[PDB]
Amino acid sequence: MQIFVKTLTGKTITLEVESSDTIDNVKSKIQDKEGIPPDQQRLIFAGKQLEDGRTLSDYNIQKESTLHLVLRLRGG
Amino acid sequence: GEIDESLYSRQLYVLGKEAMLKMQTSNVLILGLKGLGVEIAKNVVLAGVKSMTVFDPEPVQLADLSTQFFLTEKDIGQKRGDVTRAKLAELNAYVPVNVLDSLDDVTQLSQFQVVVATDTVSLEDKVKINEFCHSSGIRFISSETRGLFGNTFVDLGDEFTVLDPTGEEPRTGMVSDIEPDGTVTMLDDNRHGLEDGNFVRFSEVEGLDKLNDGTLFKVEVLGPFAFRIGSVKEYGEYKKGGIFTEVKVPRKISFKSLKQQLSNPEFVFSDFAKFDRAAQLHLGFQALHQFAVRHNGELPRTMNDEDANELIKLVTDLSVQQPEVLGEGVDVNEDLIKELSYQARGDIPGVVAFFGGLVAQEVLKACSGKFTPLKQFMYFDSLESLPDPKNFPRNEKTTQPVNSRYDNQIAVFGLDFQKKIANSKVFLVGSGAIGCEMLKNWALLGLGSGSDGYIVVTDNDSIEKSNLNRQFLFRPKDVGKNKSEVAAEAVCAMNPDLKGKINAKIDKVGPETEEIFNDSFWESLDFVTNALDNVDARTYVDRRCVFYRKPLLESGTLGTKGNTQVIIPRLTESYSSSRDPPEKSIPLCTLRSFPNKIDHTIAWAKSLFQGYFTDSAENVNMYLTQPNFVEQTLKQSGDVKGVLESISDSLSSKPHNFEDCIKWARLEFEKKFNHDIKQLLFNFPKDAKTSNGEPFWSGAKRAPTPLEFDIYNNDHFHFVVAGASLRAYNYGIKSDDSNSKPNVDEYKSVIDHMIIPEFTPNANLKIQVNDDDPDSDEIDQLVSSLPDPSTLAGFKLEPVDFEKDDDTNHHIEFITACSNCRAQNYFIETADRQKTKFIAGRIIPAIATTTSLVTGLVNLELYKLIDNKTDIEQYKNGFVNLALPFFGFSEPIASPKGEYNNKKYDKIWDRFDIKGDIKLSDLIEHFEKDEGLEITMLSYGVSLLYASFFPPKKLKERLNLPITQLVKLVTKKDIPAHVSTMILEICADDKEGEDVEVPFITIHL
């Protein structure tokens, strides 16, 4: 299935995934496309942060779902 | 009509010059000065528009003080607009704040560019005002907050132009090939970072001449390392070279009127876990106005079920009139509507700050064309902030007014919950942008105003002028004072209930102040809140909160971006549990020899600035005052070749007047930008080739050209001016006034009389090409040359301390000129002082809008701490970028769990506590006996105290020592007297002899 990952910059990333894919595996597809190490990826969907060791289906992520790649910021 | 950097520096890096120039031509009108209006007005006046006009003829009531921080109890009965005007004016002297006495005549709206209608304007009037604005070319924004609910509406007219949708730096990249079909291949593994539909221009593409003329090409992405631009056959045939630069094209976007959007709204969602509630609240907010019409302008009564059932009827009726809102067979969410009714009179600081920040930014978008406007409706609720009604029952008695400023917070949460807020004990780490917003919210909440509560806020920073644009508790007359003290004073003025309840400290929070912030201090606290501007300070507080088991409210911003995070003992992971992107590393060879970005020349110039004017001076001073310095340098230095040479230079070529400093700077110019370049070109000529036959100077390697000094070149001139002035500073030489501008002719006469040594190659010098590649009588040559310190008695150099925010001190002047000269060498586009200041000074973009919004979200999580919520699903980490605008929330991550010997433990919050300065042997014994653990390793920070591979000789020394003595043995220096606790880390094997992860140890001395 096709899902989308939107970054805090507004960039959209299109990924081909399966419901049983692990978050670890989705993050590596993001690393291929964006060059972002999985360690630094914060993925949130429908009020949940996606954790390594779970699958897309554990979070009920569907065809055409949009995930958000978010960041913590150091200013204050 | 030019922008004041000294005031707008941090915000200028967020918005840019064009946006702010256009903002400063815009007159804004805000209708209503309850909490929402004053918060919008605050952020907009700070931002800097041409004028702010406020309209609120309503008399102040006590309940208005729930969120209107510029109202005092003395002001009751007087007009909100009149009373608020003077305090808004103090925020920015550049921004006249006027009061509109009457709005009976709606054609008065024609003199404003942006009109904001807050909760004081009926929907009927909003539709009329919006129609006038829409049909007249006036930007219209509305917002209203109801308890824990809120919304905003944006209508920027028929043809609004967005000049920049994100404010992100344009992508750029080096081209390796462009095929005739337009397939653009990137250099090596460089990522273009582009998106389909992006536009790019080109420079330096040889073979495709007119491809470089600034024509835009639409991007079709072909994976991370290639994209297509359409056929280029007609432009020629690619040879080599090329840099693409992304271009943001303008975008015309059309908005519908309020009336149209009431029946067919376009939503931007605030929380995708709640996207279904937007349409429900869209009807609910309209029904509230219909209720007011039926009830003489009165909203539903607090916690009143009768009025709530009427509002459900009104929403049900409205659904039929507006069928497109909910869609077919979607029922009214009656529990949600009931809560809107129950909370309609609520006035919640966190919600008002959330919408005050975002709406204020939307105003700035309307004034400038910068960022993507909200299009067009957004609804928000923080219902998770409600405490469990079992703990704090909500009914008509518990929520009734008691004739206090908190009545409309009581309306939502109840009296007892407000009391628990008052009696809370909280620690605020930081008193800057977030700190000021945080204290303002805590004053509105009455947090720590009870007898059993208090606020401690600490910040060692003093107030500076660049603070004032986003730290609104500080006035120009406060520059130089302590932030925490001035801020505590400010919020006590806002809410006298905090008089004598804020303890303002000026101490850093770090390992060096643990005697001040001791066990007793932390153990009294209910929770901790960060208001910090770096990661290290956050990491330290996180570790403290983990150790002491205190909840921590975390937040940060970067321009329009922001985030919040909650850390709950024994529930969530901590701040340190996750990792943030590190700052990029520039290869040393890129900095040394092969720069291709201005960031490279600025870093190179900043390092040269430190060497010339700071390190050089410190080294000289120590050589003079330290008997053992020289051999130490030989025995302890990365670069003894240069450290010794610097001292020889600094003392053999001493200046005796300013002219000598000018000569020195002119000669450094020749060395850095002429000689050293010719040397590099001698090692690698323009047309040199690598072994595979390719050109050496390609891609990231740009063949430099030596500079011929030209005092009429701005960078050549100011390199000499700044370099000489800082040389003079080092040596105590007086320049020709510091507020006087330099004269080109006076410098020219000096330099013209100079004989500039010709360059002669060193034919033996290796130049390293890649970082992963290879690279003492000659030194005795240096040490013998050094002059005897006794000859130079009393002589000292005055080292420069880099201060980026003093435009008179020549620091950024030098780094700018120095960077740009190297840019000229390598044909990199130069940068001005403001951009160089941004990079060299490591300035974090900041604006009051994001700061306020993020602070609002923290104070909506704060409510959950008060109720000691243990269900992790109720907490919300927040993520924001107002430029888009994007809002997203996530459930915090549960702390990881572990097991040893079939015992379960929390890998973050659990620890072994042991009473007394136990002996190592007893510790080892205690763990095998009571925990089933064989200690294989034991450390105190950096020191290894014990390992089970230690030989019996080493064991005998150690197995008998109390921990404090065992630490002394390894570290020599021992435990300070005040320390009452020691954290030890252990590795250990389980009963099966298998290594197991295990909690840390706390020694209670």
Residue numbers in the entry:
A (entry chain B): 1 to 76
B (entry chain A): 12 to 786, 795 to 1024
What wording appears in the published article?
The dogma in post‐translational modification by ubiquitin (Ub) is that Ub‐activating enzymes (E1), Ub‐conjugating enzymes (E2), and Ub ligases (E3) are required to work together to activate the C‐terminal carboxylate of Ub, in an adenosine triphosphate (ATP)‐dependent manner, and subsequently ligate it to predominantly the ϵ‐amino group of a lysine in a substrate protein. ADPribosylation or phosphoribosylation of Arg42 in Ub impairs the conventional ubiquitination machinery because activation by E1, trans‐thioesterification to E2, and E3‐mediated discharge from the E2 were shown to be compromised upon the introduction of the modification by Legionella ligase SdeA. In addition, residue 72 is crucial for determining Ub‐like specific recognition by E1, where for Ub this residue is an arginine, for Nedd8 it is an alanine, and for SUMO‐family members it is either a glutamate or glutamine residue.
